[PDB]
Design a binder for this molecule. Structure first.
Ligand SMILES: Nc1ncnc2c1ncn2[C@@H]1O[C@H](CSCC[C@H](N)C(=O)O)[C@@H](O)[C@H]1O
Ligand SMILES: Cc1cc(C)c(S(=O)(=O)O)c(C)c1
Length: 226
């Protein structure tokens, strides 16, 4: 049962820390994997507020998708014409992502790119990213990692760039391990260490949530300011 898979996942993470992730991937305990992007992402992009960003897209607009897993989101942004990097801690995940998207034109062209990278450790390219998409990443991090997460986000997103955060699961007081209950407030506190580094341009309830996501998810768009 999936409740067992979560319980086991919390065990490995308690024992092996961040290394538990590649373990979980190769052992096949991946109860988060949904096979596809979350509908809110597509709807936002196809919406007019989102169309604004994609027409602002420069020739080499770069997208980072941290904790990308099998990389559905990365592959989505690549299909929009963005040079896109999907990065997961787990080389298994990165291998399973290259299989899953093996037939993607963007994988062949290089637009889409999957790499085993530690979000906290890798070398932020000097150009920085025009767009970062965080889904089921922030909520995977133990609470003591949210400030580094926000700190990293500040260096990763070029000024005037965009950070999209599908904030999920908004589950209230639930004290469980991964996935942690989060809310916009917890994201805001991490990102701004009010108004210091980001502008929250857009904070909405998606009209198109997955059914198990309904009432537990908000899409928030953040602009990087100097
Ligand atoms: N420091 C870190 N850097 C990069 N990826 C990490 C990471 N810590 C955990 N992860 C990865 O984030 C994922 C947690 S769940 C995968 C969720 C994925 N975004 C999806 O929509 O399916 C795991 O794949 C885990 O390996
Ligand atoms: C990191 C992580 C882990 C789990 C178990 C889940 S899920 O069970 O709610 O699908 C999600 C969404 C993210």
């Amino acid at each position: 049962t999936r409740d067992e898979k979560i319980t086991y996942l919390r065990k490995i993470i308690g024992d092996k820390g961040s290394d538990a992730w590649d373990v979980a991937w190769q052992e096949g305990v991946t109860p988060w994997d949904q096979g596809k992007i979350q509908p809110p992402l597509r709807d936002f992009i196809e919406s007019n507020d989102g169309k604004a960003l994609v027409n602002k897209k420069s020739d080499n607009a770069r997208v980072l998708v941290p904790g990308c897993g099998k990389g559905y989101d990365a592959a989505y942004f690549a299909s929009l014409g963005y040079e896109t990097l999907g990065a997961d801690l787990s080389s298994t995940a990165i291998e399973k992502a290259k299989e899953f998207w093996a037939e993607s034109p963007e994988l062949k062209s290089g637009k889409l790119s999957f790499q085993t990278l530690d979000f906290f450790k890798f070398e932020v390219p000097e150009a920085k990213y025009d767009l970062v998409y965080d889904y089921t990443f922030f909520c995977a991090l133990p609470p003591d990692l949210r400030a580094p997460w926000g700190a990293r986000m500040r260096e990763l997103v070029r000024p005037g760039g965009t950070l999209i955060t599908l904030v999920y699961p908004i589950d209230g007081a639930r004290s469980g391990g991964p996935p942690y209950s989060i809310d916009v407030q917890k994201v805001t506190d991490a990102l701004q260490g009010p108004g210091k580094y980001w502008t929250k341009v857009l904070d909405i309830v998606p009209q198109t949530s997955s059914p198990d996501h309904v009432g537990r998810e908000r899409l928030v768009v953040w602009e990087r300011i100097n």
